[PDB]
């Protein structure tokens with residue numbers, strides 16, 4: 001539905017909001033695979049995803065429904081959980097952002 005995709009745009013807008021910026025910032029833009037320590041990122045992560053790409057996919061109507069938009073948000077989180085150590089700061093940040101996402105996505 002067209003109405004449920006406007007709600008997806010609204011969930012993504014909240015994720016980009018100042019309220020969640022302290023922990024959402026690592027998810028804003030694609031992972032810089034040229035940064036120190038990330039030489040192996042592309043070897044472990046087959047399908048990278050970030051909030052700016054999801055936003056472009058929405059604007060370009062690349063999602064048939066809320067399920068497809070949801071899949072890419074969760075892909076972005078699963079990439080973070082798969083790649084990093086479970087005790088890493090970015091994993092806790094992903095968990096805080098995903099709490100915002102799952103609560104909003106569930107209530108639509």
Ligand SMILES: CC(=O)c1cc(-c2ccccc2N)[nH]c1C
Pocket residue numbers: 025026027028029030031032038079080083084090
């Ligand atoms: C490895 C990993 O999981 C990462 C790394 C970044 C990241 C770090 C610094 C500046 C921008 C970024 N995008 N973001 C995630 C989700």
